Design an enzyme around this catalytic site. Structure first.
Site, PDB file in Angstrom:
ATOM      1  CG  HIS A  84     -72.687  27.761  14.939  1.00 47.96           C
ATOM      2  ND1 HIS A  84     -71.906  28.476  14.056  1.00 47.96           N
ATOM      3  CD2 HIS A  84     -72.624  28.425  16.118  1.00 47.96           C
ATOM      4  CE1 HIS A  84     -71.386  29.521  14.675  1.00 47.96           C
ATOM      5  NE2 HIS A  84     -71.808  29.514  15.927  1.00 47.96           N
ATOM      6  CD  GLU A 127     -76.415  29.876  17.423  1.00 45.68           C
ATOM      7  OE1 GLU A 127     -75.727  29.069  16.764  1.00 45.68           O
ATOM      8  OE2 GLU A 127     -76.119  30.226  18.583  1.00 45.68           O
ATOM      9  CD  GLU A 143     -70.894  26.656  18.446  1.00 46.21           C
ATOM     10  OE1 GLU A 143     -69.906  27.431  18.429  1.00 46.21           O
ATOM     11  OE2 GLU A 143     -71.907  26.846  19.156  1.00 46.21           O
ATOM     12  CD  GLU A 166     -75.891  25.889  22.065  1.00 52.26           C
ATOM     13  OE1 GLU A 166     -77.122  26.047  21.916  1.00 52.26           O
ATOM     14  OE2 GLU A 166     -75.047  26.500  21.382  1.00 52.26           O
ATOM     15  CG  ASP A 196     -73.295  28.769  24.003  1.00 50.48           C
ATOM     16  OD1 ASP A 196     -72.272  28.254  24.496  1.00 50.48           O
ATOM     17  OD2 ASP A 196     -73.479  28.815  22.771  1.00 50.48           O
ATOM     18  NE  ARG A 235     -66.450  34.849  23.623  1.00 50.47           N
ATOM     19  CZ  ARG A 235     -67.360  34.025  23.103  1.00 50.47           C
ATOM     20  NH1 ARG A 235     -67.625  32.852  23.672  1.00 50.47           N
ATOM     21  NH2 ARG A 235     -68.006  34.371  21.997  1.00 50.47           N
ATOM     22  CG  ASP A 267     -70.071  26.038  12.423  1.00 47.83           C
ATOM     23  OD1 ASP A 267     -70.241  26.234  11.202  1.00 47.83           O
ATOM     24  OD2 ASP A 267     -69.609  26.918  13.177  1.00 47.83           O
TER      25      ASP A 267
END
Lengths: 391, 391, 390, 391, 51
Positions: free
Chosen positions: A310, A330, A260, A233, A207, A41, A283
């Site tokens: 979030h 979460e 998000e 999600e 997710d 990532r 978020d």
């Protein structure tokens, strides 16, 4: 007036740049279409921006602060754009300050990084307001609507989440639509293997990190029907919220969530229109801050759409405890193996409340503002933003 | 725990019953259909409920209060139903205390009278919270988004309103649909006369007090086109907000408002849905209180629909000063001639802010809570509600 | 072997560049507040500054482009976007956009990071033209017309008329918080312009995102005898849905938007419903030329004109090349609004400028976007390197 | 000008006429309604037009060329209609030349035969452009978005496709709606055989060559639900694309495709409108050429709809490699047995790239223009079109 | 399990309806009704708030 409290004004604002499975295990991403960006990532730059902290000092020398992602760019905007609205202002003017910052940054803003800057400033204002009043933030935004905050856990090991006392576990989808039918079969098997480990009754959510498409989502959900996935999600890009209608046509007994990576009350209104999303998931460090989130939440409550934010640490906890339509939230399993819970902001703070048993209570939040105190060890890690203006 | 302020809980609640053109001039009403009820507004029973006052005392002996319409059956419901949720509670728990009271009363409420009872308790809670904190309510709900509140004036003499420096005048419609084409002709001439009295530039708005229908509204508006009416208020029954689409189809350059006789966040979502209403106009003493009004206002803000609530004294002023989407405010010229302004709660308070020059400032609202003190002369007039429980 | 070995990208460099537009009456989103309505700089329209990106190929050919974005844009160039560029074939315009867009999606999609992507993309196209010794317009579909007709944006549409521009676009002075007086003054401002230029010269009204649905409906009603050509950016880009309501009220009146909208996904909304008569993307803002071409093609399936924001050569090479691109904007950026200066000031030596209100294909016949940096202005180019000295 | 390339203009245009399971096996067609046009595809005249080739010559002597179906009446139209626009023109003016040809032919065109003539001319332009520049066409239209073209294979033996290495196989549907319920069960058996032969994992798609209707499609699909068919292609007449809404109402988890017999950006906007088609499949030799397919792909990319064009040799390959929204494409098993892959234009070209292993790479396209050189052996077979203008 | 026991007590053919006294929401209704599909519940009553 001499009938009421002479509240301190804003004197100064300062900003600081803060010096495993999450970046090194298989997770499906918008950039997973390309071979050199799918194994890691970091390779396409999830960690590019870094973290920053904004302190706001009032005329009585009370300091409120907040932290968020955004880094050097964010710090630049704090001082170059937004500081002019803040110096000399009454910090209780949260409505006006948000609108001024949002509308003045509209030509380059509305979504994305500038609104992350706005959020963190707003959170620091709320921290300041709490600390002046000697009250926690949740006590200034409507009280407690519950005594206990229930948590689900996000990470690669939902057996760990179950063991720790979390009510549900959220796993990352490993493979993207460009991996074809082989990737699809491997996604199915990944999820099957988790369901079989936790048993038939433990909530599993998936997710999808913005990474799928309508056709793929439909094919994937259809193949996973007997796994009883609780929700799916962020299946689509936040550019294609309209696609959720077509997913709901195909799977109307299946729950889908997003949000998000959406911003402002105007962004979230589209998510609630049509009622194709079962939960919206903002978020607070990203959307505009707590003042705007309070407006997002009231819009969603009009349609009885749950708002489940979030993981933002105390910034989300005070919000969640306070609202009618905000049932649980979460937590990130941010240990390397994904098997224990660690503080969301690392060793930046000393007194972070952590749901070790899968919950928190109102008492855990009974500290002034958002209840966070900077670790005076990690004060040396706080690199001042001064250098960015040294042109 | 000891890091934060120890806030007083609710100790006791007490409730009291409070013992011209508005009733006697030509005003089109839902009861204007029938001969004996069209001359007088009292005859069908606009004044039927009367007024009541709620006090809420904290454990440190601070008292917050609010008044509303409702009278004896409202006082009944205060103690029989709603008191149970309140005693021993933290007054900062506004979200909780509302959600309980609403959902408990849902089997006979949702709209109407029991919601008016909830409104007055909520407002009294807010008064108390401001008083404990030594702060005006508006500094607790988002601060000031502007320094000045501009007022239009409701009543039969908008030249008077013009002279007093109100920006606009709202006149009531004299004649109903059942007076036929003669009544329409007289309506038109009524509005024509007011226009040439105030000249071409002064804002005139017409209140239709729920009394018309789709075809009649369309006819009446068409006939008045060159009179430049600013908006048309409450043309339909609150039972038929759906007709506003049909009305907007006919007259899409013409401004229509409603909402005075609508309740809850779920009532108002209808009105914002079509975007067929230029302003929504809730009554804070009626809709469920300030806590619910803030949520209605947030939903409306996502669509940039202005909320201009009913003339409710300080309860609407504190709200109006605080929001992004709340541009101005109504005052009612409740003098007999309609030619001066009077206090909205009459004898009851010593220190009602009144916009005698057509505006108020933030400085006018700078008193603890909603800033009303009960006039000790009028304390004889408030009758304890004890008698209603002597069965 | 049988085909050209094209140079790959060697390096990328970025640099920060170191009146009626800011001090006259213009309606803005920040005109709601007393302290922010006299000046446009007060709330910080000028906050970001300008930046320039150079992209150098393995054969030493340098492509460049400039935009607004300044120091935080530069930061993003090297920190995020440089990783996708070094060693790549510059002809891979589709791949490099998609990588940059989808990598930045967590903080991007609209706004500042997309301005970064745009300028990078424009610089790539500059490079491609320069390697091929061809203008950008010859690479993206050729000339569909010989002549670009300009309208002029500024406070003096009589000057516009006199200079050879076909139309004039004026800024709306007052916002909805100025009330009914403001509306009356807005009407009066527009009447004065109609009367000065006469009944037949096109005037258009820039509303700079500042209004709402009800105010727009009321204002347009009041100006109906003035025959305004179009009304531009009446609403916040957050509320494009409101144009359905505005068109319900005024279906014979022309409405435009899109200056502060971004990407092919943002623009599709503006084409859905066909409530907007023109869409007006900014090439330096939306994503770049690669994405603009896609926005243009989408629009062309519904025959919506795309008439971009004034962007100098970056929009000229676009406008001349497309079926659905009938004219474009020039900004009168002289202090009085009575003459035309170069858009980028003194940064380039050879900006094509429509002094007689038009340009030709011959004016665009230079390699790439046809801009050459003024070496007097090269000292103003501050290297971005100070921003990474942590 | 003297600052840029002096690019050769178009000197001359020439046109030439070119002198098993596909015609003789069980395939459902629109003409399968009637008994004497059921057994043979040639009987109703699939082969009726034949092929043609257009050469465009620039003033520097460089020749670009393209081939398509159309034959004699196509060649007629090239010189009678379209030649007037091209002689003297810059071939880089692809945008001009398409609009001119399209809008000038609008009175008898928009769809079908004249548009095929437009396509071939446009493809010959792109070949010339590539050849003058010494670059492949894909490097002129966006570059490569991928290194590998993956192919699925179309013909009556998917086991042959599987063995050759294509990722999926597309079989023709044998029987039409007019073959009744017996024909339906025969169709189902056909498909069940093929699923059994290739096993449970191998992608099977079904070409229905425009031949079905809404009710038939819905019944046939429901009957094949156990056979996990990948997609159903061209189920409806191109005249009834609205019926896909009704099909997707019945089968929202099933994939459906069309586009092969649709034309222009205006034809295709309909197909992406409503999003009832998972893939759109234009024929580049049919729809208007490469210039127009680029615009169709962009429209589709805004809605993340895959374009997977009809097998058209290098003309499709250069497009497929170049675009974000173009994941794989088609090759036809054009051997008599349906069991091997042969050049799509036969012996006409010396160097046609063929995916014998079910893929192609960017290196295969690395020849100037579309990479086809014309076989001087087959140069005798090119009949000049001059005879059609000898009246 | 509450409703399955009632289905089993009266057997397969006798009509059973469920009063939900305004207490559910859209997601929970959709989930619950899905979970009870083999119970052949005749109708579901006031699942949603009258709002």
């Amino acid at each position: 007036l001499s009938s009421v409290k002479d509240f301190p004004k804003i004197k100064a604002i300062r900003s600081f740049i803060i010096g495993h499975w999450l970046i090194d295990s298989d997770i499906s991403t918008p950039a997973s279409k390309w071979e050199q960006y799918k194994k890691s990532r970091t390779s396409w730059g999830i960690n590019v921006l870094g973290s920053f902290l904004v302190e706001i000092e009032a005329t009585d020398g009370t300091v409120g602060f907040a932290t968020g992602f955004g880094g050097p760019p964010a710090c630049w905007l704090v001082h170059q754009h937004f500081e002019r609205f803040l110096i000399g202002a009454d910090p209780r003017n949260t409505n006006l300050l948000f609108e001024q910052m949002y509308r003045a940054s509209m030509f380059y803003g509305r979504k994305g990084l500038p609104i992350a800057v706005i959020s963190v400033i707003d959170l620091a204002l709320w921290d300041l307001l709490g600390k002046v009043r000697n009250e926690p933030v949740y006590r200034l935004i409507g009280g407690a609507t519950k005594e206990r905050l229930d948590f689900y856990c996000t990470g690669p090991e939902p057996t760990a989440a179950k063991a720790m006392g979390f009510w549900g576990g959220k796993v990352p989808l490993p493979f993207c639509p460009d991996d074809g039918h082989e990737g699809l079969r491997k996604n199915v098997e990944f999820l099957r293997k988790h369901r079989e480990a936790v048993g038939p009754d433990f909530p599993i959510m998936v997710d999808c990190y913005m990474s799928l498409n309508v056709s793929y989502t439909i094919e994937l959900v259809k193949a996973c029907l007997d796994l009883n996935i609780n929700w799916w999600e962020e299946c689509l890009s936040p550019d294609d919220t309209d696609g959720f209608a077509l997913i709901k046509r195909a799977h109307p007994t299946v729950k889908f969530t997003t949000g998000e990576h959406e911003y402002s009350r105007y962004g979230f209104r589209k998510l609630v229109e049509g009622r194709n999303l079962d939960i919206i998931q903002p978020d607070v460090m990203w959307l505009g801050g707590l003042t705007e989130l309070l407006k997002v939440a009231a819009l969603a409550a009009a349609y009885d759409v749950p708002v489940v934010p979030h993981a933002s640490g105390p910034y989300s906890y005070h919000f969640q405890i306070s609202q009618p339509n905000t049932p649980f939230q979460e937590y990130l399993a941010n240990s390397p193996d994904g098997k224990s819970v660690l503080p969301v902001f690392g060793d930046l703070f000393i007194d972070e409340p952590i749901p070790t048993k899968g919950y928190l209570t109102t008492a855990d939040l009974d500290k002034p503002g958002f209840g966070l105190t900077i670790n005076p060890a990690a004060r040396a890690k706080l690199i001042p933003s001064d250098y960015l203006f040294k042109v």
